[PDB]
mmCIF file of C-alpha atoms in Angstrom:
data_model
loop_
_atom_site.group_PDB
_atom_site.id
_atom_site.type_symbol
_atom_site.label_atom_id
_atom_site.label_comp_id
_atom_site.label_asym_id
_atom_site.label_seq_id
_atom_site.Cartn_x
_atom_site.Cartn_y
_atom_site.Cartn_z
ATOM 1 C CA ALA A 1 0.056 0.293 0.082
ATOM 2 C CA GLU A 2 2.484 2.883 1.081
ATOM 3 C CA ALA A 3 4.681 2.696 -2.221
ATOM 4 C CA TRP A 4 1.578 2.726 -4.865
ATOM 5 C CA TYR A 5 0.315 5.827 -2.312
ATOM 6 C CA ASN A 6 3.533 7.309 -3.078
ATOM 7 C CA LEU A 7 3.500 7.041 -6.484
ATOM 8 C CA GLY A 8 -0.190 8.294 -6.711
ATOM 9 C CA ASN A 9 1.682 11.579 -4.779
ATOM 10 C CA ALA A 10 4.423 11.927 -7.286
ATOM 11 C CA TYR A 11 1.753 11.740 -9.922
ATOM 12 C CA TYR A 12 -0.302 14.359 -8.027
ATOM 13 C CA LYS A 13 2.355 16.315 -7.936
ATOM 14 C CA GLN A 14 2.836 16.623 -11.913
ATOM 15 C CA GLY A 15 -0.793 17.038 -12.297
ATOM 16 C CA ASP A 16 -1.221 13.787 -13.353
ATOM 17 C CA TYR A 17 -4.673 13.280 -11.491
ATOM 18 C CA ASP A 18 -5.995 10.275 -13.656
ATOM 19 C CA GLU A 19 -2.880 8.277 -12.690
ATOM 20 C CA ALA A 20 -2.831 9.435 -9.083
ATOM 21 C CA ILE A 21 -6.119 8.261 -8.699
ATOM 22 C CA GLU A 22 -5.447 4.658 -10.225
ATOM 23 C CA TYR A 23 -2.895 4.504 -8.010
ATOM 24 C CA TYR A 24 -4.255 6.142 -4.901
ATOM 25 C CA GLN A 25 -7.333 2.970 -5.950
ATOM 26 C CA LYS A 26 -4.489 0.300 -5.815
ATOM 27 C CA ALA A 27 -3.149 1.623 -2.515
ATOM 28 C CA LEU A 28 -6.509 1.501 -1.100
ATOM 29 C CA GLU A 29 -7.044 -2.260 -2.946
ATOM 30 C CA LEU A 30 -4.452 -3.212 -0.132
ATOM 31 C CA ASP A 31 -5.212 -1.463 2.214
ATOM 32 C CA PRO A 32 -8.611 -0.020 2.858
ATOM 33 C CA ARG A 33 -8.017 1.816 5.977
ATOM 34 C CA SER A 34 -5.702 3.931 4.694
ATOM 35 C CA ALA A 35 -7.645 7.694 5.610
ATOM 36 C CA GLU A 36 -4.480 9.243 3.730
ATOM 37 C CA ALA A 37 -5.095 7.757 0.583
ATOM 38 C CA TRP A 38 -8.612 8.011 0.995
ATOM 39 C CA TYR A 39 -7.984 11.811 1.253
ATOM 40 C CA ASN A 40 -5.334 12.243 -1.377
ATOM 41 C CA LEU A 41 -7.791 10.392 -3.590
ATOM 42 C CA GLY A 42 -10.348 13.163 -2.651
ATOM 43 C CA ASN A 43 -7.999 15.918 -3.297
ATOM 44 C CA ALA A 44 -7.422 14.335 -6.331
ATOM 45 C CA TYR A 45 -10.708 13.904 -7.710
ATOM 46 C CA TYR A 46 -11.003 17.569 -6.158
ATOM 47 C CA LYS A 47 -8.538 19.186 -8.431
ATOM 48 C CA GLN A 48 -10.034 17.107 -11.520
ATOM 49 C CA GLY A 49 -13.367 19.245 -10.689
ATOM 50 C CA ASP A 50 -15.141 16.135 -9.203
ATOM 51 C CA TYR A 51 -16.720 17.691 -5.955
ATOM 52 C CA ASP A 52 -19.045 15.216 -5.592
ATOM 53 C CA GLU A 53 -16.524 12.470 -5.337
ATOM 54 C CA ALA A 54 -13.971 14.378 -2.806
ATOM 55 C CA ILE A 55 -17.142 14.440 -0.321
ATOM 56 C CA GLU A 56 -17.386 10.837 -0.884
ATOM 57 C CA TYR A 57 -13.464 10.309 -0.283
ATOM 58 C CA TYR A 58 -13.125 12.975 2.428
ATOM 59 C CA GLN A 59 -15.484 11.548 4.169
ATOM 60 C CA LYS A 60 -14.461 8.372 4.106
ATOM 61 C CA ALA A 61 -10.959 9.456 5.564
ATOM 62 C CA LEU A 62 -12.464 11.876 8.239
ATOM 63 C CA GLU A 63 -14.595 8.549 9.644
ATOM 64 C CA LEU A 64 -11.027 6.744 9.839
ATOM 65 C CA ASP A 65 -9.473 9.668 11.060
ATOM 66 C CA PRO A 66 -11.144 12.682 12.370
ATOM 67 C CA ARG A 67 -8.089 14.202 13.964
ATOM 68 C CA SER A 68 -7.334 16.537 10.793
ATOM 69 C CA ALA B 1 -8.762 20.745 10.955
ATOM 70 C CA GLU B 2 -7.601 20.715 7.117
ATOM 71 C CA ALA B 3 -9.393 17.932 6.181
ATOM 72 C CA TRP B 4 -13.002 19.335 7.867
ATOM 73 C CA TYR B 5 -12.163 22.419 5.965
ATOM 74 C CA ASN B 6 -11.523 20.627 2.657
ATOM 75 C CA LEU B 7 -14.552 18.821 3.068
ATOM 76 C CA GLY B 8 -15.966 22.200 3.758
ATOM 77 C CA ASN B 9 -14.386 23.869 0.566
ATOM 78 C CA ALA B 10 -16.044 20.828 -1.725
ATOM 79 C CA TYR B 11 -19.295 21.506 -0.262
ATOM 80 C CA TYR B 12 -19.438 24.895 -0.953
ATOM 81 C CA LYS B 13 -18.037 24.543 -4.586
ATOM 82 C CA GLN B 14 -21.246 22.295 -5.130
ATOM 83 C CA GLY B 15 -23.235 25.490 -3.388
ATOM 84 C CA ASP B 16 -24.073 22.942 -0.116
ATOM 85 C CA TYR B 17 -23.595 26.322 1.843
ATOM 86 C CA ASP B 18 -25.036 24.415 5.064
ATOM 87 C CA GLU B 19 -23.423 21.566 4.717
ATOM 88 C CA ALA B 20 -20.010 24.206 4.468
ATOM 89 C CA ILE B 21 -20.904 25.800 7.281
ATOM 90 C CA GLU B 22 -21.005 22.767 9.078
ATOM 91 C CA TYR B 23 -17.529 21.265 8.065
ATOM 92 C CA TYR B 24 -15.645 24.880 8.499
ATOM 93 C CA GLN B 25 -17.541 24.651 11.934
ATOM 94 C CA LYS B 26 -16.058 21.381 12.948
ATOM 95 C CA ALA B 27 -12.643 22.641 11.367
ATOM 96 C CA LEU B 28 -12.669 25.800 13.788
ATOM 97 C CA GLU B 29 -13.561 23.725 16.952
ATOM 98 C CA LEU B 30 -10.461 21.853 16.336
ATOM 99 C CA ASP B 31 -7.981 24.804 14.982
ATOM 100 C CA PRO B 32 -9.825 28.205 16.121
ATOM 101 C CA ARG B 33 -7.274 30.343 14.619
ATOM 102 C CA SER B 34 -7.327 29.012 10.987
ATOM 103 C CA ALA B 35 -7.991 32.235 8.911
ATOM 104 C CA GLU B 36 -9.162 30.581 6.353
ATOM 105 C CA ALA B 37 -11.470 28.570 7.862
ATOM 106 C CA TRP B 38 -13.681 31.925 9.502
ATOM 107 C CA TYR B 39 -13.155 33.287 5.916
ATOM 108 C CA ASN B 40 -15.009 30.912 3.995
ATOM 109 C CA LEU B 41 -17.198 30.421 6.703
ATOM 110 C CA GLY B 42 -18.134 34.056 6.208
ATOM 111 C CA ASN B 43 -17.914 33.500 2.315
ATOM 112 C CA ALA B 44 -20.318 30.882 2.999
ATOM 113 C CA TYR B 45 -22.758 33.057 5.129
ATOM 114 C CA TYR B 46 -22.222 35.814 2.184
ATOM 115 C CA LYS B 47 -23.465 33.151 -0.374
ATOM 116 C CA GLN B 48 -26.852 32.505 2.107
ATOM 117 C CA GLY B 49 -27.430 36.370 2.064
ATOM 118 C CA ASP B 50 -26.798 36.584 5.785
ATOM 119 C CA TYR B 51 -24.232 39.345 5.799
ATOM 120 C CA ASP B 52 -24.179 40.179 9.131
ATOM 121 C CA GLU B 53 -22.898 36.887 10.002
ATOM 122 C CA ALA B 54 -20.074 37.119 7.049
ATOM 123 C CA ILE B 55 -19.390 40.165 8.483
ATOM 124 C CA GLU B 56 -18.538 38.602 11.896
ATOM 125 C CA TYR B 57 -16.465 35.730 10.347
ATOM 126 C CA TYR B 58 -14.367 38.090 7.930
ATOM 127 C CA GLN B 59 -13.424 40.248 10.807
ATOM 128 C CA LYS B 60 -12.107 37.339 13.062
ATOM 129 C CA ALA B 61 -10.365 36.380 9.497
ATOM 130 C CA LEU B 62 -8.748 40.122 9.027
ATOM 131 C CA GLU B 63 -7.738 40.221 12.781
ATOM 132 C CA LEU B 64 -5.979 36.989 12.596
ATOM 133 C CA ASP B 65 -4.121 38.066 9.100
ATOM 134 C CA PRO B 66 -4.860 41.318 7.835
ATOM 135 C CA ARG B 67 -2.663 41.043 4.680
ATOM 136 C CA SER B 68 -5.378 40.317 2.346
ATOM 137 C CA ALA C 1 24.625 -3.831 -2.095
ATOM 138 C CA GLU C 2 22.825 -3.690 1.770
ATOM 139 C CA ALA C 3 25.782 -1.818 2.976
ATOM 140 C CA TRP C 4 25.957 0.907 0.019
ATOM 141 C CA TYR C 5 22.158 1.042 0.499
ATOM 142 C CA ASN C 6 22.586 1.511 4.407
ATOM 143 C CA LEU C 7 25.117 4.205 3.766
ATOM 144 C CA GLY C 8 22.572 5.820 1.118
ATOM 145 C CA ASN C 9 19.933 5.682 3.921
ATOM 146 C CA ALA C 10 22.102 7.101 6.819
ATOM 147 C CA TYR C 11 22.515 10.069 4.416
ATOM 148 C CA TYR C 12 18.951 10.368 3.367
ATOM 149 C CA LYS C 13 18.217 10.418 7.210
ATOM 150 C CA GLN C 14 20.967 13.330 7.387
ATOM 151 C CA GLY C 15 19.207 15.414 3.701
ATOM 152 C CA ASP C 16 21.680 14.572 1.431
ATOM 153 C CA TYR C 17 19.434 13.466 -1.129
ATOM 154 C CA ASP C 18 22.628 13.754 -3.965
ATOM 155 C CA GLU C 19 24.955 11.638 -1.561
ATOM 156 C CA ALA C 20 21.913 9.043 -0.930
ATOM 157 C CA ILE C 21 21.404 9.033 -4.852
ATOM 158 C CA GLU C 22 24.908 8.160 -5.641
ATOM 159 C CA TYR C 23 25.494 5.285 -2.954
ATOM 160 C CA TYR C 24 21.706 3.645 -3.850
ATOM 161 C CA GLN C 25 22.945 3.714 -7.439
ATOM 162 C CA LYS C 26 25.922 1.794 -6.454
ATOM 163 C CA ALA C 27 23.629 -0.730 -4.406
ATOM 164 C CA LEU C 28 21.564 -0.926 -7.796
ATOM 165 C CA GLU C 29 24.568 -1.479 -9.555
ATOM 166 C CA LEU C 30 25.830 -4.454 -7.303
ATOM 167 C CA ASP C 31 21.724 -5.930 -6.964
ATOM 168 C CA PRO C 32 19.677 -4.453 -9.471
ATOM 169 C CA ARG C 33 16.830 -6.135 -8.311
ATOM 170 C CA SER C 34 16.536 -4.705 -4.909
ATOM 171 C CA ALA C 35 12.972 -3.309 -5.034
ATOM 172 C CA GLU C 36 13.945 -1.645 -1.382
ATOM 173 C CA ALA C 37 17.224 0.371 -3.274
ATOM 174 C CA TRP C 38 14.739 1.641 -6.383
ATOM 175 C CA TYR C 39 12.286 2.745 -3.620
ATOM 176 C CA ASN C 40 14.636 4.654 -1.606
ATOM 177 C CA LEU C 41 16.167 6.064 -4.820
ATOM 178 C CA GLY C 42 12.641 7.072 -5.648
ATOM 179 C CA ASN C 43 11.788 8.581 -2.311
ATOM 180 C CA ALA C 44 15.549 10.995 -2.629
ATOM 181 C CA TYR C 45 14.446 12.392 -6.227
ATOM 182 C CA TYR C 46 10.573 13.259 -4.317
ATOM 183 C CA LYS C 47 12.476 14.905 -1.791
ATOM 184 C CA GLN C 48 14.984 16.677 -4.262
ATOM 185 C CA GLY C 49 11.554 17.510 -6.167
ATOM 186 C CA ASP C 50 12.454 15.153 -9.234
ATOM 187 C CA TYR C 51 9.130 13.764 -9.408
ATOM 188 C CA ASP C 52 9.656 12.354 -12.804
ATOM 189 C CA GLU C 53 12.369 10.694 -11.440
ATOM 190 C CA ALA C 54 10.432 9.280 -8.335
ATOM 191 C CA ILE C 55 7.775 7.919 -10.776
ATOM 192 C CA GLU C 56 10.573 5.899 -12.979
ATOM 193 C CA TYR C 57 12.107 4.407 -10.183
ATOM 194 C CA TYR C 58 9.424 3.591 -7.686
ATOM 195 C CA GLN C 59 7.448 1.918 -10.683
ATOM 196 C CA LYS C 60 10.958 -0.236 -11.111
ATOM 197 C CA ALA C 61 10.361 -1.030 -7.262
ATOM 198 C CA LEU C 62 6.591 -1.675 -7.750
ATOM 199 C CA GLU C 63 7.329 -3.793 -10.648
ATOM 200 C CA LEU C 64 9.852 -6.263 -8.680
ATOM 201 C CA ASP C 65 7.931 -6.224 -5.856
ATOM 202 C CA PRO C 66 3.958 -4.930 -5.389
ATOM 203 C CA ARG C 67 3.152 -5.846 -1.511
ATOM 204 C CA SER C 68 3.556 -2.470 -0.681
ATOM 205 C CA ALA D 1 38.621 -9.686 17.783
ATOM 206 C CA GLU D 2 35.640 -12.110 16.889
ATOM 207 C CA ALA D 3 34.585 -12.615 20.372
ATOM 208 C CA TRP D 4 34.469 -9.274 21.441
ATOM 209 C CA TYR D 5 32.267 -8.722 17.972
ATOM 210 C CA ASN D 6 29.943 -10.868 19.093
ATOM 211 C CA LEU D 7 29.572 -9.996 22.464
ATOM 212 C CA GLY D 8 28.470 -6.458 20.448
ATOM 213 C CA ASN D 9 26.041 -8.369 18.515
ATOM 214 C CA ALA D 10 24.227 -10.144 20.962
ATOM 215 C CA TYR D 11 23.783 -6.449 23.388
ATOM 216 C CA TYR D 12 23.072 -5.284 19.914
ATOM 217 C CA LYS D 13 20.044 -7.678 19.931
ATOM 218 C CA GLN D 14 18.616 -6.414 22.567
ATOM 219 C CA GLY D 15 18.573 -2.800 22.033
ATOM 220 C CA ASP D 16 21.762 -1.981 24.082
ATOM 221 C CA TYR D 17 23.377 -0.077 21.670
ATOM 222 C CA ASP D 18 25.720 1.721 24.014
ATOM 223 C CA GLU D 19 27.111 -1.549 24.887
ATOM 224 C CA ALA D 20 27.737 -3.035 21.532
ATOM 225 C CA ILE D 21 29.717 0.019 20.574
ATOM 226 C CA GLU D 22 31.502 -0.592 23.394
ATOM 227 C CA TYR D 23 32.643 -4.076 22.725
ATOM 228 C CA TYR D 24 32.486 -3.290 18.652
ATOM 229 C CA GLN D 25 34.881 -0.739 19.465
ATOM 230 C CA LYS D 26 37.237 -3.446 21.840
ATOM 231 C CA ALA D 27 36.855 -5.824 18.852
ATOM 232 C CA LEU D 28 38.324 -3.090 16.537
ATOM 233 C CA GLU D 29 41.288 -2.151 18.801
ATOM 234 C CA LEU D 30 42.554 -5.444 18.303
ATOM 235 C CA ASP D 31 41.370 -6.189 14.478
ATOM 236 C CA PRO D 32 41.447 -2.387 12.846
ATOM 237 C CA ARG D 33 40.296 -4.292 9.500
ATOM 238 C CA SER D 34 37.369 -5.853 10.218
ATOM 239 C CA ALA D 35 34.665 -4.575 8.086
ATOM 240 C CA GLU D 36 32.072 -6.035 9.859
ATOM 241 C CA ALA D 37 33.008 -4.577 13.060
ATOM 242 C CA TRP D 38 32.827 -1.041 11.530
ATOM 243 C CA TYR D 39 30.014 -1.618 9.667
ATOM 244 C CA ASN D 40 27.907 -3.209 13.107
ATOM 245 C CA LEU D 41 29.589 0.245 14.607
ATOM 246 C CA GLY D 42 27.733 2.243 11.954
ATOM 247 C CA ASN D 43 24.777 0.261 12.562
ATOM 248 C CA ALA D 44 24.694 0.888 16.187
ATOM 249 C CA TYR D 45 24.945 4.279 15.759
ATOM 250 C CA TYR D 46 22.613 4.516 13.036
ATOM 251 C CA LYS D 47 19.904 2.889 15.743
ATOM 252 C CA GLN D 48 21.088 5.323 18.194
ATOM 253 C CA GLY D 49 19.952 8.619 15.302
ATOM 254 C CA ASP D 50 23.502 9.057 15.565
ATOM 255 C CA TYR D 51 23.568 9.513 11.037
ATOM 256 C CA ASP D 52 27.005 11.657 10.846
ATOM 257 C CA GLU D 53 28.835 8.607 12.799
ATOM 258 C CA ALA D 54 26.923 5.679 10.850
ATOM 259 C CA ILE D 55 28.270 7.260 8.084
ATOM 260 C CA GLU D 56 31.621 7.734 9.190
ATOM 261 C CA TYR D 57 32.298 3.755 10.050
ATOM 262 C CA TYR D 58 29.970 2.866 6.926
ATOM 263 C CA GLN D 59 32.532 4.133 4.792
ATOM 264 C CA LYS D 60 35.783 3.394 6.656
ATOM 265 C CA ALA D 61 33.790 -0.648 6.727
ATOM 266 C CA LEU D 62 32.613 -0.236 2.969
ATOM 267 C CA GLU D 63 36.496 0.823 1.731
ATOM 268 C CA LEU D 64 37.732 -2.554 3.707
ATOM 269 C CA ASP D 65 34.933 -4.430 1.572
ATOM 270 C CA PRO D 66 32.915 -2.972 -0.589
ATOM 271 C CA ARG D 67 31.067 -6.058 -1.874
ATOM 272 C CA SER D 68 27.740 -5.736 -0.164
#
């Protein structure tokens, strides 16, 4: 999971939001309780302008970890 | 705080101003010195037409950070 | 390979990312199938802000070992 | 030298990194060309978080034996 997520982050940093999504989803298939991966997934969709998906994934993330 | 605020922003982008308010208030319960969260709170009330609350929260925000 | 990689890691811990790269590349010249060394190589470039190289090396690492 | 080093290793296995250092240094006083003892010395300092000493001793070890 962590390495897929970091790959996801590297693509996110380059503005490759679809790639970032594909790798965050792969990190999530391996660790479905990664709040970090759901959150960054939400961020990725937020950047594509899909705010309804960002809501969905931000809420899954906040439910795993409400601290932030 | 940051994740609640971004959830707030995602709802704001969809015109869900009451949800945005509820999540910005939750970001503020965790970080009461977030100028960004007070400001966006003010924006949310401004969009609902409650200009007196927008004044209130914009002033709290400008008092934390007068730069903008 | 392992000792070069650990030297690489010691430099990485100090924020000496160019040294870390040079030693991880030397660990890789000796063991080209070290997923750990490719990954930390990717991390090192990620920290320098070269996200396109991080992508490159993270992908080589995930291809040797997709578990993480 | 070998017995001091193994004593060092036994302490290392228990997380007694200062003892491990003291015994590896004693193995080195007797055999200054023990790459194994310099390396494990570096490991011991790495575990204490002294990465600059780990660098120092890992480099002495790799200079006696660059294979690993």
